[PDB]
């Protein structure tokens, strides 16, 4: 079954999107149709996975003869699946036998006839609470268009035999012929491996039927469903023949254009006009200048003065293709807290052709750019910052990528004064340097690293999180790994690299509970019990 996602223009667009449509994945909205312009523009539709909004319809007859069940994955306003109102004499909704989720709205249809006698109790299921059916089993058109009463367990509309292999429209999903309560699970549990495994027989979900691979431009989501596009919290990434909707690593890539290229081609600084076009943005393509005229405000550019609290919109920028020049920052903030999350300033375009990160003439105590790792092309100048201290400590050769990259860290607070004032890097920071005054803002660590923080020693023997040192990093053990005091409590990450288990242990793995009821091989549920030794034994 093919699937689909002025008065004349509306009619043309709707006839274009719904002509061949057989199952409507979104909501079929039939609104604003002029008189005597509809001719079988949508007749074969058989399941609309959403709401049918047939409102303000001047045409006399909207056939929709074959729509069998309108899913109701949405609603019109609230519990509103079929919205026929404010239109239309004949609507022979002959085939619509169940609207699973939602209700039917009748109002402002003086011309609609023979539909008030449709036994809508069969059509709607348990959502009669908002069933405003106020505006003999027959949907109109004389005879042969009868309501076909059938209701007044994987079959929705009706049955063509006492077999789940032959049913009109399946309630939840349909693998190939039989109506299943759910898709064949993507990952299958094998007691041999004691872990979930990709099931060859499993199929991803495309709407109301189960599909081994999602055709066209459909991306597999986390829940196995193949949505048209990834959600806001996910990104599109291809690993196999079908792409998957991988969850975003914090703010996902939203390439914006910076000041100088694009809509901000002629903008001067990151003005109050420019800002809020960069909200939730990462990998800004172009420069990202913050000149003082941003904070003063400008009249010949007619841009209101920038409130300092809005510069925190730029905290999401995790990469810059051009240059990052921060030539004035709010005087009440002690560290460049807007650019804390920057990772690479690739610097393809440079300010005056030279500098790729210039922090000139600000009053910040510490540069506070803890996360910057590569400043690829241009130089880096940090000057004038008359209160900047923990600055020269970081080894400027390590981050920059091309050997000609320089640094002109000048005219900042003197090193002798920086140390005399008690402003030196915390002890838990390797001799590489430190971005500020705190342990988190350290270039590299002496011993361990509990995330960004550089701790004195991983909780190898004593601690609440019970780290296990790895590649000079503290990695929280899996919660099932109970802390052991005589030795380390976990050799490595995961549930199968820990000595003592707080909960039961299933094979090599330690889990909260033994696997019970989980889908396993041969489409058979698996249940496991625990012995006195917290070992999970297969039943």
């Amino acid at each position, epitope marked *: 079954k093919k699937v689909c996602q002025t008065f004349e223009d509306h009619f043309l667009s709707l006839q274009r999107m719904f002509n061949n449509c057989e199952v409507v994945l979104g909501n079929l909205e039939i609104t604003y149709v002029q008189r005597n312009y509809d001719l079988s523009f949508l007749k074969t539709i058989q399941e609309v996975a959403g709401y049918v909004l047939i409102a303000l319809n001047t045409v006399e007859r909207i056939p929709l003869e074959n729509l069998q069940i309108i899913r109701g994955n949405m609603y019109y306003e609230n519990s509103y699946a079929l919205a026929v109102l404010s239109n239309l004499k004949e609507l022979p909704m002959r085939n619509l036998q169940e609207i699973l989720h939602g209700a039917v709205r009748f109002s402002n249809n003086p011309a609609l006839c023979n539909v008030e006698s449709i036994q809508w109790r069969d059509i709607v299921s348990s959502d009669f609470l908002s069933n405003m059916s106020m505006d003999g089993s027959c949907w109109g058109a004389g005879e042969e268009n009868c309501q076909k009463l059938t209701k007044i367990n994987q079959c929705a509309a009706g049955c063509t035999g006492p077999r789940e292999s032959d049913c009109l429209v399946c309630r939840k999903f349909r693998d190939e012929a039989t109506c299943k309560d759910t898709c064949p699970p993507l990952m299958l549990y094998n007691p041999t491996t004691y872990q979930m495994d990709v099931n060859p027989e499993g199929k991803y979900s495309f709407g109301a039927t189960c599909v081994k691979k999602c055709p066209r431009n459909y991306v597999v989501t986390d829940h196995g469903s193949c949505v048209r596009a990834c959600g806001a919290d996910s990104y599109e990434m291809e690993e196999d023949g079908v792409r998957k909707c991988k969850k975003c690593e914090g703010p996902c890539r939203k390439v914006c254009n910076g000041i100088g290229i694009g809509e901000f081609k*002629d903008s001067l600084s990151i003005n109050a006009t420019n800002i809020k076009h960069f909200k939730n943005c990462t990998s800004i393509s172009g420069d990202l200048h913050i000149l003082p005229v941003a904070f003063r405000g*400008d*009249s*010949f*550019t007619h841009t209101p003065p920038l409130d300092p609290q809005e510069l925190d919109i730029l905290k999401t920028v995790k990469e810059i293709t051009g240059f990052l020049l921060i030539q004035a920052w709010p005087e009440n903030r002690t560290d460049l807290h807007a650019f804390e999350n920057l990772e690479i300033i690739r610097g393809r375009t440079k300010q005056h052709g030279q500098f790729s990160l210039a922090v000139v003439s600000l009053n910040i105590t510490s540069l506070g750019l803890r996360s910057l790792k590569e400043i690829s092309d241009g130089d880096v100048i940090i000057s004038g910052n008359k209160n900047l201290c923990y600055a020269n400590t970081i080894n400027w050769k390590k981050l920059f990528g091309t050997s000609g990259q320089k640094t002109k860290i000048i005219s900042n607070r003197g090193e002798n004064s920086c140390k005399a004032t008690g402003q030196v890097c915390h002890a838990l920071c390797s001799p590489e340097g430190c971005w500020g005054p705190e342990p988190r803002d350290c270039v590299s660590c002496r011993n361990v690293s509990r995330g960004r923080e550089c701790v004195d020693k991983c909780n190898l023997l004593e601690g609440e999180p019970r780290e296990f040192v790895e590649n000079s990093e503290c990695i929280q053990c899996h919660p099932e790994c109970l802390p052991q005091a005589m030795n380390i409590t976990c050799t490595g990450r995961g549930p199968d690299n820990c000595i003592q288990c707080a909960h039961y242990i299933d094979g090599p793995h330690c889990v909260k509970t033994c696997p019970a009821g989980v889908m396993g091989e041969n489409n058979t549920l698996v249940w496991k019990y625990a012995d006195a030794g917290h070992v999970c034994h297969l039943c």
Partner: single-chain antibody
Amino acid sequence: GGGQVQLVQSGAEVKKPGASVKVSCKASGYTFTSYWMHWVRQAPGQGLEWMGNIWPGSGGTNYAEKFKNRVTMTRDTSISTAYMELSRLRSDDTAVYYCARSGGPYFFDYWGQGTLVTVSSDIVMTQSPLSLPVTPGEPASISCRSSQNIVHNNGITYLEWYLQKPGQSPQLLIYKVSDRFSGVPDRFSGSGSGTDFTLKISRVEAEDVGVYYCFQGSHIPPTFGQGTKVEIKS
């Protein structure tokens, strides 16, 4: 002047028709790369007329259509001096060309001395009074009208009144429709909304005598009014 934003312009330029004149404005006391040096002209017999900006930090100049093909403005950030070359001098180009410096809530905050370039062979704002005479002490009021609504899309009306006291460069008096600049007496108090603006000087003194030029910058080419030479009735 050690710290005071003081712009000093070239001045005293005499040319011949069809030639080119280049005028500079040495900006001192401020980050010359942080404020635009907008340049405004006041022809004899006419009110102030903007002649285009330049953001000396980047050199990216805007220009006025009445000279877009004729005058070019270039910055010299190293020496802190904006420059303006007006080419093909006509007869009607003899005027005084001032170099402003558009501030945050005000345009033309601190204005240069002004260069008189004598050469010889747009939301229209008209000021309702003109050569309105008053008596020392008597309250006076000069009205000014806008061709369109000068309420900008951002919601801030860039209406202003600048008072070119005799022999002095114009200096802002009402920074927005109503707010008074810092250093102006409480006597000067503009008002208005929509399209019409009226300035009410509550007690005309000896020093307030001089042309109050109404400028509207919510339109793209900054357009001033004709300006009413308020004078003491002897």
